[PDB]
Amino acid sequence: LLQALLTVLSQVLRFMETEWYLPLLVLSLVLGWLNLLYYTRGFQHTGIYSVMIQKVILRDLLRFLLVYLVFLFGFAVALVSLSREARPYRSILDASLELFKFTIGMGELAFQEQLRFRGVVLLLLLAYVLLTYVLLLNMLIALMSETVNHVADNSWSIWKLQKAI
Amino acid sequence: LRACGRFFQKHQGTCFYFGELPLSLAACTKQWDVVTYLLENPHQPASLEATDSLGNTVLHALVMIADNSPENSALVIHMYDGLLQMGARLCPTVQLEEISNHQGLTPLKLAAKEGKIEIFRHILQREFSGPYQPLSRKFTEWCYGPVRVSLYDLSSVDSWEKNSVLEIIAFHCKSPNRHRMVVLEPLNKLLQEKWDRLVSRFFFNFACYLVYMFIFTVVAYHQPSLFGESMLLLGHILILLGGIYLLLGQLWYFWRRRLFIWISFMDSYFEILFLLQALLTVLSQVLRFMETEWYLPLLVLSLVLGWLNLLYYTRGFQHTGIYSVMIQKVILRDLLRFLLVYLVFLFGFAVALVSLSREARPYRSILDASLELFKFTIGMGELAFQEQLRFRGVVLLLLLAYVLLTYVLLLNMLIALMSETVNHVADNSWSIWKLQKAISVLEMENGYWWCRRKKHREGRLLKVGTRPDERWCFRVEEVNWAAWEKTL
Amino acid sequence: LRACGRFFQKHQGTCFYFGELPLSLAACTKQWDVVTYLLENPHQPASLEATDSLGNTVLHALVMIADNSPENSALVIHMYDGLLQMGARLCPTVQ
Ligand SMILES: CCCCCCCCCC(=O)OC[C@H](COP(=O)([O-])OCCN)OC(=O)CCCCCCCCC
Ligand SMILES: CCCN(CCC)S(=O)(=O)c1ccc(C(=O)O)cc1
Numbered sequence: 091l092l093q094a095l096l097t098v099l100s101q102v103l104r105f106m107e108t109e110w111y112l113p114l115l116v117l118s119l120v121l122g123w124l125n126l127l128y129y130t131r132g133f134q135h136t137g138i139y140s141v142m143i144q145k146v147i148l149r150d151l152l153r154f155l156l157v158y159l160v161f162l163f164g165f166a167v168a169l170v171s172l173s174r175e176a177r178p179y180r181s182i183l184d185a186s187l188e189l190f191k192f193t194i195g196m197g198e199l200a201f202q203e204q205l206r207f208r209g210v211v212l213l214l215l216l217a218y219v220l221l222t223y224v225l226l227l228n229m230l231i232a233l234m235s236e237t238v239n240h241v242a243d244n245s246w247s248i249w250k251l252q253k254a255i
Numbered sequence: 256l257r258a259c260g261r262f263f264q265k266h267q268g269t270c271f272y273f274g275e276l277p278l279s280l281a282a283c284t285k286q287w288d289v290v291t292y293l294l295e296n297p298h299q300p301a302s303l304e305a306t307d308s309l310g311n312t313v314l315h316a317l318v319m320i321a322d323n324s325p326e327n328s329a330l331v332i333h334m335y336d337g338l339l340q341m342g343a344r345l346c347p348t349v350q351l352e353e354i355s356n357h358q359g360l361t362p363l364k365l366a367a368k369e370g371k372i373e374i375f376r377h378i379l380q381r382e383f384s385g386p387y388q389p390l391s392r393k394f395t396e397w398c399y400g401p402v403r404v405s406l407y408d409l410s411s412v413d414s415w416e417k418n419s420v421l422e423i424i425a426f427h428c429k430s431p432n433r434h435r436m437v438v439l440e441p442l443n444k445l446l447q448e449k450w451d452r453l454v455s456r457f458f459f460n461f462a463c464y465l466v467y468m469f470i471f472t473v474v475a476y477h478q479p480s481l482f483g484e485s486m487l488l489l490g491h492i493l494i495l496l497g498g499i500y501l502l503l504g505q506l507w508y509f510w511r512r513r514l515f516i517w518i519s520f521m522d523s524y525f526e527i528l529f530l531l532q533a534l535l536t537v538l539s540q541v542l543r544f545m546e547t548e549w550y551l552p553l554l555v556l557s558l559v560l561g562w563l564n565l566l567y568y569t570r571g572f573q574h575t576g577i578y579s580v581m582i583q584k585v586i587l588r589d590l591l592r593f594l595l596v597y598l599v600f601l602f603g604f605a606v607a608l609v610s611l612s613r614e615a616r617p618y619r620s621i622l623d624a625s626l627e628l629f630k631f632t633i634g635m636g637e638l639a640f641q642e643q644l645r646f647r648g649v650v651l652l653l654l655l656a657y658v659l660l661t662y663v664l665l666l667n668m669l670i671a672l673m674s675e676t677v678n679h680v681a682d683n684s685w686s687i688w689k690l691q692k693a694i695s696v697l698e699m700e701n702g703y704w705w706c707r708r709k710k711h712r713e714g715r716l717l718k719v720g721t722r723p724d725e726r727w728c729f730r731v732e733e734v735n736w737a738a739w740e741k742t743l
Numbered sequence: 744l745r746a747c748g749r750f751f752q753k754h755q756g757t758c759f760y761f762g763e764l765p766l767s768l769a770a771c772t773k774q775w776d777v778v779t780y781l782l783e784n785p786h787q788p789a790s791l792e793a794t795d796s797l798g799n800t801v802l803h804a805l806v807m808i809a810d811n812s813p814e815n816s817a818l819v820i821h822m823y824d825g826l827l828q829m830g831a832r833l834c835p836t837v838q
Contacts, residue, residue, distance in 0.1 A: 153578035157566060164562025168555045171475045175551070195634025199626055206481075210552045212626075214559065219633060224590065225582070227672070232581045234677045400759045400772065732757040736808075740815060743773050 093121040131252045141245040141252070145237050154229045161225065162189055165218040172214070175206035192219055193226070259308045265319065274316030275307035282313050282334050283320045290334075294341055303342045303351055310356035311365075313338055318362050321371040323432070328373035335362075335374065336381075339390050352378075359418060363411055367423045370430020376439050379412070379420075389722045396730070401739040406717060406728035407441035413727065414449070414697055415710045421446070425690075425697045429518050434686040437693045441729050445713060446689065449696045454571070456699055461568040467497040468561050471536075475558045481548055491540065498536030498557075505530035507704040522687075523694060525567045532560040570691045580684040580691070584676050593668045600664065601628055604657040611653070614645035631658055632665070747796045753807065762804030763795035770801050770822050771808045778822075782829055791830045792837060801826055 096118040103111035130136040166185040173179035179188065191197045199215055202208050257275035265272035273283035278301040281289040293301040306312055311319065314335060321331045342351045352362055360368060366375035382393045392408040414421045424436050437446060474490035477483075508526055512519035520527050535557040542550035569575040605624040612618035618627065630636045638654055641647050702708030714729035745763035753760035761771035766789040769777040781789040794800055799807065802823060809819045830837060 150578065150581075153575055154582070156569070156575060157579075157582065160562055160566055164559050167472050167476060167562075168559045171478060171558070172551060172555045174478065175481060192633060197633055197635065199630060199633070199635070201622060201626065206548070207552055210555070214555075217559075224585065227669075228582045228585045231584045231672060231676050234673065235584065236581075236682075238677060239679055400761065402757065402759050734757060734759070736810065736815075737812070740773075740818065 093118055093125055096121065131249065134249070137249045137252065138245045141248045142243075146233055150229070150233060150236070154225070157225060158222070161218065161221055162186055165189055165214060168214055169211065172207050172211055173205055176204055177206035177208070178204075179211075189218060192222060257307055264308075272316075272319060274311055274313060274319070276305055276313075277301065278303075278305065279307065279311075279313045279316040282338065283316060285330055285334060287334070287337065290337070291341070294345055300345075303338060303346060304349060304354065306354075306356070310358070312351065312354050312356075312362070314351055314354075314362040315356055315360070315365055318366045318369065318371050318374055321366075321369075321374045323371070323373050325373075328377075331374050332377050335377070340387055343387060343390060360423075361411060364418070364420060364423055367420045367436065368428050370428055370432050370436070372432050372435055372439075375436060379407070379442070380440060388720050389724055391719075394719050394728070401734050401736040403733045403735070405440075405731050405733070406719065407714075407731060408719075409441065409445070409712075409714045409727045409729050412442070413445070413713050414700055415712045421693065421697055425694045426512060426519060427515050429521070434683060434690040437690050438686050440733070441731050443689070444731050445729055446693050446696060448713065449700065450692055453696055453699045457568075457571050457695065460699075461565075461571065464565065464568070467493075467501075468565060470494065470497075471558055471561055475554055478551065478554070481551075491543070494536060495540045498533050498540065501529060502533035502537055504704045505533055508698075511701075522690075525564065528560060528564055529567075532557055532564055535560065570688065570695060573688070576688045576691065577684045580687045581682075585672055589668070589672060589675070593664070596664060597661070600657065600660055601625055604628055604653060607653055608650065611646050611650055612644055615643055616645035616647070617643075618650075628657060631661060745795055752796075760804075760807060762799055762801060762807070764793055764801075765789065766791075766793065767795065767799075767801045767804040770826065771804060773818055773822060775822070775825065778825070779829070782833055788833075791826060791834060 096114050100111050100114035100118055103114060127140070130140045163182070163186065166182050166189055169179045169185045169189070170182060173185075179185045188198065197215075197219070199212070199219075201212055205211055256277070258280075259275050262270055263272060263275055264270055273280045278290065278293050281293055294303070303313060307316070309315075317331050317335045317338075321327060339351060342349060355361055356365065358365075358368075363375070363378045365371075366378060378392065380393050382391045382395065394406040394408075396404045396406055398404070412420045421442065424433055424442075428436075436442065470490055470493050474487065474494055477487055477490075479487075505526060509516060509519065509530070535553050539550050539553035539557055542553060566579070569579045602621070602625065605621050605628055608618045608624045608628070609621060612624075618624045627637065636654075636658070638651070638658075640651055644650055700708075700710060712727055714727045716725055717728045718725050719728065744765070746768075747763050750758055751760060751763055752758055761768045766778065766781050769781055782791070791801060795804070797803075805819050805823045805826075809815060
């Protein structure tokens with residue numbers, strides 16, 4: 091439904107000649123490729139796997155996200171505030187994206203010589219990294235304790251229900 | 256006679272505590288024919304009222320011999336009920352469970368303090384009929400199909416009274432099973448009734464901390480280089496006053512909880528973190544009035560710590576609350592031990608890389624080399640055959656050795672955490688969250704440090720027999736189809 | 744008579760739904776000697792067709808008392824089959 095709405099809206103915005111048609115057309119395109127994963131239920135082999143891949147619900151990741159976004163934005167406002175003085179964390183979006191890069195293996199640590207309080211900026215980054223790795227490790231171990239419990243694999247039955255619907 | 260020497264005292268060494276008197280010995284050994292003889296003989300009767308060097312009666316001594324195994328529990332429970340029945344015949348004017356030891360504890364308060372959950376549940380939910388009905392704490396009011404309606408005696412339980420079972424479980428007990436005690440009847444429904452009348456105050460306290468942290472963030476983001484200037488001054492005095500208010504409220508918490516202070520923060524470290532945030536806030540405003548540059552690091556550390564402090568209020572909802580408990584799995588217990596091994600590898604290879612990189616043919620300092628070595632743990636470590644160095648091949652072999660040792664250590668640490676944490680034990684996170692709600696409520700029931708509110712009794716004053724036997728009793732309705740159908 | 748007040752309705756609170764009528768109570772409690780008496784007595788027989796305030800018969804009420812545990816299932820199943828066999832003798836024209 092959402093892909094079809096965004097598709098019709100993108101064509102309405104294209105007839106209005108507004109630039110924002112292209113973001114809607116491109117969001118409809120991504121969502122339309124993700125929609126082809128529906129038809130994986132037509133075969134037993136992919137179908138049942140599409141059910142096995144539901145293990146980690148948004149139930150826990152949306153809760154972890156609350157804790158993670160408080161760490162992210164709390165350290166982002168702090169790094170921007172402290173980096174104002176020279177002796178670059180220029181905005182909350184800039185510092186949030188630099189702090190998020192640590193979760194994808196891309197985070198820059200430097201003793202950043204051009205700043206005043208550079209040592210406190212480095213200690214804030216080291217504290218954010220250590221807290222985030224404690225949080226991610228706790229989140230992963232808490233998912234294993236909930237999901238890896240040797241209960242019978244009901245994925246064949248849940249796929250037979252997808253076929254029934 | 257009181258066997259009171261160091262062998263007969265309770266301690267971690269070689270001892271046998273049973274109380275100190277013959278009757279308490281005969282009860283703790285399960286000699287019911289010696290107990291009735293010592294009580295009923297004509298030559299010299301024992302008294303159930305008699306106390307040892309801690310002020311413990313035989314009923315306190317029975318709570319002291321309890322472990323939570325089912326056989327020891329059944330034997331302590333049979334002996335405890337037998338001695339109450341005996342007291343109802345030999346000293347019927349005396350309430351044996353109202354006798355306090357030298358710590359001010361009755362047998363029920365001692366069972367709560369010492370974490371004796373099986374005898375604690377038994378005393379709290381006890382019921383009898385015919386001659387012993389006045390010895391009950393639970394009274395069935397009516398039963399119809401799967402539904403039982405009961406009155407529970409709240410006399411030493413409700414937090415309206417000083418040093419109650421609720422205050423003891425929350426703040427004076429140090430047993431790991433505190434969270435199992437708060438989910439028993441009548442404590443479960445009683446704590447829910449207290450939560451439901453305080454949940455609006457909990458989210459008012461959260462909203463005031465959100466407004467304080469919003470003002471803190473707006474002010475920290477608009478600091479000048481070392482109308483809007485007047486609003487920035489207003490923001491600094493609101494941060495000063497909020498910092499003083501939180502500081503006074505937290506110092507008052509640690510003053511009220513001074514007798515048990517080393518446990519008052521053990522599952523409640525947010526009382527340390529709220530105190531520390533308030534201190535660093537007040538210090539940042541003092542340093543700002545002194546015009547020293549170091550005010551800004553303190554203001555910014557207070558800001559970070561204040562956003563981390565908002566994670567306290569996740570306990571207000573079942574969904575986030577219980578998850579905040581599930582996310583405690585990996586304690587600092589193992590990561591602080593792993594950190595010892597990791598910091599020896601880090602600094603041992605850092606001094607080595609700095610020493611060997613001195614010669615050309617850049618690891619310039621211990622901080623530089625420590626940060627380059629730490630970058631391997633976050634997926635950012637540079638490996639190069641570093642051509643400008645003398646011994647470049649040995650520098651590369653030191654880096655490859657550090658990487659392989661660190662990946663062996665991290666893999667060992669992760670596998671050792673899985674072996675400790677992923678063991679299919681029952682998910683007690685709901686109970687530990689009900690204990691967080693219990694601690695929060697028992698704090699909110701006092702009101703604020705400046706407001707000191709009056710408390711109200713819960714349950715109703717009701718006649719239960721002769722035992723007239725009038726008590727503050729709390730109505731609980733249990734529906735239990737699975738227990739009921741087994742009786743048919 | 745239909746015990747129909749809020750205690751006898753199905754909801755998340757404190758209640759005992761069994762249907763609302765004596766026969767549905769006697770079936771939901773497993774009193775098979777009260778069920779046959781209420782059905783077969785000469786003074787006033789119960790009807791298996793009788794419905795409560797939701798339109799539930801005693802067979803709907805038995806489905807409503809079911810949990811998926813093996814003992815509760817065996818007891819609901821025995822009572823349900825017994826009442827169909829009784830209907831085959833007391834109201835044989837009625838499905
Ligand atoms: C001298 C009397 C002053 C009366 C002020 C009345 C304020 C009412 C709001 C209130 O107490 O909110 C509590 C909140 C901290 O939450 P908590 O108590 O659960 O604590 C957390 C426990 N884990 O507190 C805050 O967030 C601070 C609010 C900002 C300061 C208010 C003005 C102060 C003037 C001196
Ligand atoms: C207030 C309601 C009481 N009723 C139950 C309603 C379903 S009752 O039918 O009057 C009743 C039943 C059983 C007992 C008993 O066993 O003690 C007492 C009273």
